[PDB]
Design a protein around this ligand. Structure first.
Ligand code: MG
Ligand code: MG
Ligand code: MG
Ligand code: MG
Ligand code: MG
Ligand code: MG
Ligand code: MG
Ligand code: MG
Ligand code: MG
Ligand code: MG
Ligand code: MG
Ligand code: MG
Ligand code: MG
Ligand code: MG
Ligand code: MG
Ligand code: MG
Ligand code: MG
Ligand code: MG
Ligand code: MG
Ligand code: MG
Ligand code: MG
Ligand code: MG
Ligand code: MG
Ligand code: MG
Ligand code: MG
Ligand code: MG
Ligand code: MG
Ligand code: MG
Ligand code: MG
Ligand code: MG
Ligand code: MG
Ligand code: MG
Ligand code: MG
Ligand code: MG
Ligand code: MG
Ligand code: MG
Ligand code: MG
Ligand code: MG
Ligand code: MG
Ligand code: MG
Ligand code: MG
Ligand code: MG
Ligand code: MG
Ligand code: MG
Ligand code: MG
Ligand code: MG
Ligand code: MG
Ligand code: MG
Ligand code: MG
Ligand code: MG
Ligand code: MG
Ligand code: MG
Ligand code: MG
Ligand code: MG
Ligand code: MG
Ligand code: MG
Ligand code: MG
Ligand code: MG
Ligand code: MG
Ligand code: MG
Ligand code: MG
Ligand code: MG
Ligand code: MG
Ligand code: MG
Ligand code: MG
Ligand code: MG
Ligand code: MG
Ligand code: MG
Ligand code: MG
Ligand code: MG
Ligand code: MG
Ligand code: MG
Ligand code: MG
Ligand code: MG
Ligand code: MG
Ligand code: MG
Ligand code: MG
Ligand code: MG
Ligand code: MG
Ligand code: MG
Ligand code: MG
Ligand code: MG
Ligand code: MG
Ligand code: MG
Ligand code: MG
Ligand code: MG
Ligand code: MG
Ligand code: MG
Ligand code: MG
Ligand code: MG
Ligand code: MG
Ligand code: MG
Lengths: 93, 271, 46
RNA sequence: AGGACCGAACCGACUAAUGUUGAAAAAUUAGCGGAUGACUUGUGGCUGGGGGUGAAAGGCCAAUCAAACCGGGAGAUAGCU
RNA sequence: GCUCGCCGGAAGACCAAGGGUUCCUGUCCAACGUUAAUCGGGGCAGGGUGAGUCGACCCCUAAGGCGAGGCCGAAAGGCGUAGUCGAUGGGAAACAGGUUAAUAUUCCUGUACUUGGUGUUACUGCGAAGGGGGGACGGAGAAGGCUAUGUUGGCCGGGCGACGGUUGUCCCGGUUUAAGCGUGUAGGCUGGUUUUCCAGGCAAAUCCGGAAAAUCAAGGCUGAGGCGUGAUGACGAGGCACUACGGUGCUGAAGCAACAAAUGCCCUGCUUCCAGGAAAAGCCUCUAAGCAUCAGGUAACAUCAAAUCGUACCCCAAACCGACACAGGUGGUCAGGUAGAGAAUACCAAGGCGCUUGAGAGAACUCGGGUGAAGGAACUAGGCAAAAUGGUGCCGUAACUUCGGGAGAAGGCACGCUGAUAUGUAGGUGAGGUCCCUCGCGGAUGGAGCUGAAAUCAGUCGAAGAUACCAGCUGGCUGCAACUGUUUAUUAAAAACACAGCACUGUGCAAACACGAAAGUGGACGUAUACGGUGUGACGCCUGCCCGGUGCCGGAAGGUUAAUU
């Protein structure tokens, strides 16, 4: 039982890329940017609550920020978490 | 027994090994083993406090019963065994009550013999008695010095102690070193010499043989520089000094015992 | 040939890390000196 | 069986030539020694400076050692340049 | 794109450590790249790392660290008990195929497995901070049984050849399939089974250890591989159609046998030696307190859960350690063909490269090599360097010797190819068939097929048959050190150091000695056949005289002599 504020915080944005598009067409999987401390169970519960779909499994990876130089000054982007969410082959969000 | 190797190599030319066919060839008794890792001569400060120690073969400690205080229950010798931790052989004995113990093997003790400790034990090798019950003139080993503490004198291969006099609460022993010592008659002693008396006839034959036993090379003092040893320095082979230890104490004849606490028990020094 | 710096993160941490510094008063004095100087990196941990 | 023998990996470093503002602040090339052992190696640990460790050369202790390095006494002192 | 060359026990592939975006795509060439650059590990933007089973985390410990109280110390602190950390070690479980530009044992397909929680059903003595077993352990050697793998044959598909020949004993290619599940084989170990009793395992125990009978004599444990299934599946040469020249879609033959064979597996096994070869938990089992027709235990079934972190890329290197895109260093794993003893070496496969300045010329001189008339150490400090020797089998081999050696002493002979012995022998393997029954992963016979030395005889070619690569120079006298080792990282490898052996000496255990204001620790869980120090340095024959000097040991009658009074 994960409370509604937690569920409303964990999801951040959908991830837009060609690998994501291919996954969504081919394996019924959406790719999301989630909260850095979100767990698989929380992502599953949040997806089901706020998209009223069904989920069988979640796969998570943490992306590491890219070190970038901006006008001769070292700067590092933030690490974020990415989730691969599989839907139960009838949902089609 | 004592057998010379054949000179098939320079390292084997001079090796003499002592081989006992009667030693158990299998693994030791698992319930009576601990672990004892090596020190390297280093103390809890991490400093070398004894030199020429290091390396060697891994060993496991066999709990030997030096107290021999299971009185009245006879035991039978199961097998002689090789102990890497001492120069003597240990015999595994089995008590009538189903308990097994390691004891130092006396001379002539073979598998199947009966041993027993206590004041009522018979006068035969392997039997531990109080020294007031042991007759005067007997040859003992594994002697105690404080009653109930455990045997401490004459534990090495071939060693033993003579009982030369019993006057009062004290018995006079002729220690292996030649020193005559007094000890309380209540302390225990096992009858007979320690076995493996041929242990001193072995010849290591090569430097690696001594390295196997954890002994490291000894550098002569006269081969060093003066900053390292009192004997150091010289152009060519020079000595011109009185021999001393690496810490300046004269090392040929200067006595170092100072124990007024135990001076009273020494009837006569070893000479 | 074999140079003197053979990197190893575990040994680096166990020898010059924040907790190894804080384990002793001399280490804490090291940390105090570095804080007073204003070092942006107190220890090797970061 | 063997601190046995010949010989790769591996560990070493006897000779010669090259290089010597080097390809390299110690190497390359051709030969050379050991190669089941007192062998070699990975990982971790311990020993701290008049101290360690040293099969001992005053060797080694981070390219530094007849007393490491860093900071301080300190602008030591310098009848010398 | 086509040729050419190089590595192939690596200069190929995969990890660990270390690095951190270098990975992939688009774009740009100012600076960086020792030149140009359209290129790049460069700049800029975007993308990319998916796990119940891999690793960490986690449970458990080693060395060692920290350490409540404690002991000790001017202070700071030092040591350490109970504890608690600490892998480089022990502990549950997944494979094959497919797919991206970049991830995959992580995604998809197929087929599995492990642990734990619940909830029903049946039966039921459960219970530990305690007992026992187990985990759980060396070096060397040898052999048998296998597999990975390779070769050939069969089979299938294709081919009939740029120049003489090539429908054949001809050429090219393919001939693959896992974990799991079932079976239990080569081998290894072990006598079982049931009663009774017990000074042991801190108490208890039905568990372990011990004792005594009875009975049966075969039961158990472990175990590679093979076989069956997984799998009518997948993969598959190739063929057909395409975008669009990257690659997509469809279909898909054969998919067997023999032989050889590991350094891999059975095997933590076996034999043997002495230098005598971790710990703790998980696991199995026994009970105590306690609970007691409850809990809890076992079994079956259903259901749920397995979180978090890493995952790109380099990794003998242009990405790590060397200031460099630096001829250096860097642990582990894999291990094809031909010849060979071989992981050497030569040529090759898979695979990867041509080393980020070139074009000419063809002087001296320098570097690295080839050959050299006659002579052959005359060179030189010195045969430094070079040249030479170099394999296998057989014959043969001196002084001396510690009887092992010296010794590969020295020296010599044979060596290719073809045929026959023998259309391929001795040997190895071993089908069908038949027989036997304990009927099967069985035993006997049998020899098809496959593989296959070595030798002799005869012939034959060349200047030369160990033809390349590869691969001891030998002997004599002598000093030193016995020997194998070690050493001045970076001018000294030796005759120096060590050494086994010898001797002197200290040390009676709370040992001497050493580190330490101390507590403590090492010596040593050792006990005079032991330990420390010193000198000498295998072995053989030996080791002579001097105690005056200095040192040490012993003595204590006398002289002198501190604090103190
Ligand atoms: Mg999944
Ligand atoms: Mg144990
Ligand atoms: Mg010593
Ligand atoms: Mg010695
Ligand atoms: Mg010297
Ligand atoms: Mg010293
Ligand atoms: Mg001196
Ligand atoms: Mg002289
Ligand atoms: Mg003189
Ligand atoms: Mg050898
Ligand atoms: Mg040799
Ligand atoms: Mg190496
Ligand atoms: Mg040199
Ligand atoms: Mg070389
Ligand atoms: Mg070599
Ligand atoms: Mg050799
Ligand atoms: Mg200082
Ligand atoms: Mg000198
Ligand atoms: Mg430095
Ligand atoms: Mg240095
Ligand atoms: Mg000084
Ligand atoms: Mg001053
Ligand atoms: Mg100063
Ligand atoms: Mg000044
Ligand atoms: Mg002056
Ligand atoms: Mg090309
Ligand atoms: Mg080639
Ligand atoms: Mg890393
Ligand atoms: Mg970058
Ligand atoms: Mg790239
Ligand atoms: Mg690009
Ligand atoms: Mg340029
Ligand atoms: Mg330009
Ligand atoms: Mg780039
Ligand atoms: Mg993950
Ligand atoms: Mg695992
Ligand atoms: Mg500990
Ligand atoms: Mg402590
Ligand atoms: Mg305290
Ligand atoms: Mg722990
Ligand atoms: Mg580990
Ligand atoms: Mg593990
Ligand atoms: Mg990749
Ligand atoms: Mg236990
Ligand atoms: Mg182990
Ligand atoms: Mg063994
Ligand atoms: Mg072994
Ligand atoms: Mg096979
Ligand atoms: Mg196979
Ligand atoms: Mg055909
Ligand atoms: Mg033709
Ligand atoms: Mg063919
Ligand atoms: Mg199969
Ligand atoms: Mg029993
Ligand atoms: Mg081997
Ligand atoms: Mg990868
Ligand atoms: Mg590579
Ligand atoms: Mg370059
Ligand atoms: Mg390089
Ligand atoms: Mg090969
Ligand atoms: Mg050859
Ligand atoms: Mg090669
Ligand atoms: Mg190729
Ligand atoms: Mg020229
Ligand atoms: Mg020339
Ligand atoms: Mg020549
Ligand atoms: Mg000539
Ligand atoms: Mg000539
Ligand atoms: Mg001549
Ligand atoms: Mg001559
Ligand atoms: Mg001359
Ligand atoms: Mg001349
Ligand atoms: Mg001359
Ligand atoms: Mg020469
Ligand atoms: Mg030559
Ligand atoms: Mg020859
Ligand atoms: Mg000779
Ligand atoms: Mg010969
Ligand atoms: Mg035959
Ligand atoms: Mg075969
Ligand atoms: Mg002479
Ligand atoms: Mg001379
Ligand atoms: Mg020598
Ligand atoms: Mg040598
Ligand atoms: Mg060394
Ligand atoms: Mg060296
Ligand atoms: Mg040098
Ligand atoms: Mg003697
Ligand atoms: Mg003590
Ligand atoms: Mg000498
Ligand atoms: Mg005198
Ligand atoms: Mg005197």
């Amino acid at each position: 039982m994960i409370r509604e504020e937690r569920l409303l915080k964990v999801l951040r944005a959908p991830h837009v890329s060609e690998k994501a598009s291919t996954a969504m067409e081919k394996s019924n999987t959406i790719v999301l940017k989630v909260a850095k401390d979100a767990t698989k169970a929380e992502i599953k519960a949040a997806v089901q609550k706020l998209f009223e779909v069904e989920v069988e499994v979640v796969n998570t990876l943490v992306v590491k920020g890219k070190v970038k130089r901006h006008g001769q000054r070292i700067g590092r982007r933030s690490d974020w978490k990415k989730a691969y969410v599989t839907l139960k082959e009838g949902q089609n969000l | 027994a004592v057998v010379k190797c054949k000179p098939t190599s320079p390292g084997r030319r001079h090796v003499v090994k002592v081989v006992n066919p009667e030693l158990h060839k299998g693994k030791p008794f698992a319930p009576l083993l601990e672990k004892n890792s090596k020190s390297g001569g280093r103390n809890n400060n991490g400093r070398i406090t004894t030199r020429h120690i290091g390396g060697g073969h891994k060993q496991a400690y066999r709990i030997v019963d030096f107290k021999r205080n299971k009185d009245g229950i006879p035991a039978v010798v199961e097998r002689l065994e090789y102990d890497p931790n001492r120069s003597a052989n240990i015999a595994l004995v089995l008590y009538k009550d189903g308990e097994r113990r390691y004891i130092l093997a006396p001379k002539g003790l073979k598998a199947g013999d009966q041993i027993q400790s206590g004041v009522d034990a018979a006068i035969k090798p392997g039997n531990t008695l109080p020294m007031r019950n042991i007759p005067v003139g007997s040859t003992v080993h594994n002697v105690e010095m404080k009653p109930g503490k455990g045997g401490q004198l004459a534990r090495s291969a071939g060693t033993y102690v003579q009982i030369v006099a019993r006057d009062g609460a004290y018995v006079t022993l002729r220690l292996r070193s030649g020193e005559m010592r007094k000890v309380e008659a209540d302390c225990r002693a096992t009858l007979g010499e320690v076995g493996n008396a041929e242990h001193m006839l072995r010849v290591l034959g090569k430097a690696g043989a001594a390295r196997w036993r954890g002994v490291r090379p000894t550098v002569r003092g006269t081969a060093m520089n003066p900053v390292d040893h009192p004997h150091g320095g010289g152009e060519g082979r020079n000595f011109g000094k009185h021999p001393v230890t690496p810490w300046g104490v004269q090392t040929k004849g200067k006595k170092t015992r100072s124990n007024k606490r135990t001076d009273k028990f020494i009837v006569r020094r070893r000479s | 040939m074999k140079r003197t710096f053979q990197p190893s993160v575990l040994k680096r941490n166990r020898s010059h890390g924040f907790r190894a510094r804080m384990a002793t008063k001399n280490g804490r004095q090291v940390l105090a000196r570095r804080r007073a100087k204003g070092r942006a990196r107190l220890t090797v941990s970061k």
